[PDB]
């Protein structure tokens, strides 16, 4: 009911006054139900009737028809209960709030907290929690929620990846020189072991998630003398040593879970 409020809002005549109120402000339903009183005296107190669309023409002319005024009561009310909602919040600053659900993740309200421009940690913190209480209410909620969960899956990633690289690299003294791949049947043709050891232990070091750090990794063999006469690892593109690197990974999360339940045999 209060769904099918905001749906109509965003014809049939409205009063000129009417208060603007958004979904993600969380306002009572009670506010609604008087706000639609409104709606349905004013529609009353001039022409309106309500077109074609016979049952539902009935219902809807009803409401119209037996409309009444508020009572001083009800305008009272009214008042009082626009200001129960976040008044405060923009629909540009509740999308910075979703921006960071995305970026740290639900659970990281620490960070999300100092992340929207405009409003105090203890107002973020606020509003959180009325959010995740009825964030079904919102029009948009599907769309939110993939948005946050598929930055959480990418944080959950970045977690792997960091994990995965820093048990393998404690296993060598000196893993630029030391590091093994278990290939099984993914190895492929082009790439030689020498080439994917310093992949691995090179994008390891300048930090695997770190912005530009395919070409900053392609730069790094460019100047390592081991590869002079290496023509096609020093030709590789910035996505092909990405697309390496992603194979080359998958194949060490692979060896860590057999190494895993292998020590589960004791
Ligand atoms: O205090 C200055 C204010 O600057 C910015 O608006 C911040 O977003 C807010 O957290 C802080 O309260
Ligand atoms: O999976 C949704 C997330 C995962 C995490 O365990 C929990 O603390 C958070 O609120 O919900």
Same mark, same amino acid.
């Given at each position: 009911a209060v769904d099918a409020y905001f749906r109509e809002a965003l014809?049939a005549?409205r009063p000129?006054?009417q208060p603007i109120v958004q979904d993600f402000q969380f306002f009572p339903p009670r506010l609604f139900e008087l706000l639609d009183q409104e709606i349905y005296?004013?529609?009353?107190?001039?022409?309106?009737?309500?077109?074609?669309?016979?049952?539902?023409?009935?219902?809807?002319?009803?409401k119209?028809?037996?409309?009444?005024?508020? /009572?001083?009561?009800?305008?009272?009310?009214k008042?009082?209960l626009?200001?129960?909602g976040? /008044?405060?919040?923009?629909?540009?600053?509740?999308? &910075?709030?979703?921006?960071?659900?995305?970026? !740290?993740?639900?659970?990281?309200?620490?960070?999300?907290?100092?992340?929207?421009?405009?409003?105090?940690?203890?107002?973020?913190?606020?509003?959180?929690?009325?959010?995740?209480?009825?964030? /079904?209410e919102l029009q948009?909620?599907?769309?939110?929620?993939? &948005?946050?969960?598929? @930055?959480? @899956?990418?944080?959950?990633?970045?977690?792997?990846?960091?994990?995965?690289?820093? &048990?393998?690299?404690?296993?060598?003294?000196?893993?630029?020189?030391?590091?093994?791949?278990? !290939? @099984?049947?993914?190895?492929?043709?082009?790439?030689?072991?020498?080439?994917?050891?310093?992949?691995?232990?090179?994008?390891?070091?300048?930090?695997?998630?770190?912005?530009?750090?395919?070409?900053?990794?392609?730069?790094?063999?460019?100047?390592?003398? &081991? *590869?002079?006469?290496?023509? *096609?690892?020093?030709?590789?593109?910035?996505?092909?040593?990405?697309?390496?690197?992603?194979?080359?990974?998958?194949?060490?999360?692979?060896?860590?879970?057999?190494?895993?339940?292998?020590?589960?045999?004791?």
């Amino acid at each position: 009911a209060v769904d099918a409020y905001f749906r109509e809002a965003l014809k049939a005549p409205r009063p000129p006054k009417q208060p603007i109120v958004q979904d993600f402000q969380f306002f009572p339903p009670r506010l609604f139900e008087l706000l639609d009183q409104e709606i349905y005296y004013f529609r009353k107190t001039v022409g309106y009737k309500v077109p074609k669309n016979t049952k539902v023409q009935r219902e809807e002319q009803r409401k119209i028809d037996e409309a009444e005024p508020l /009572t001083e009561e009800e305008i009272q009310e009214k008042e009082n209960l626009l200001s129960q909602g976040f /008044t405060a919040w923009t629909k540009r600053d509740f999308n &910075q709030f979703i921006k960071a659900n995305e970026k !740290y993740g639900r659970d990281d309200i620490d960070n999300i907290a100092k992340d929207v421009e405009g409003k105090t940690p203890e107002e973020v913190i606020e509003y959180n929690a009325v959010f995740w209480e009825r964030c /079904t209410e919102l029009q948009d909620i599907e769309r939110i929620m993939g &948005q946050i969960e598929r @930055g959480e @899956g990418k944080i959950q990633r970045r977690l792997s990846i960091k994990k995965a690289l820093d &048990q393998k690299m404690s296993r060598y003294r000196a893993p630029f020189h030391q590091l093994r791949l278990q !290939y @099984g049947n993914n190895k492929g043709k082009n790439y030689t072991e020498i080439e994917d050891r310093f992949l691995v232990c090179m994008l390891h070091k300048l930090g695997f998630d770190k912005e530009n750090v395919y070409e900053e990794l392609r730069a790094a063999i460019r100047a390592s003398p &081991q *590869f002079r006469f290496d023509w *096609f690892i020093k030709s590789r593109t910035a996505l092909e040593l990405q697309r390496r690197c992603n194979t080359l990974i998958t194949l060490i999360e692979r060896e860590n879970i057999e190494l895993e339940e292998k020590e589960r045999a004791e």
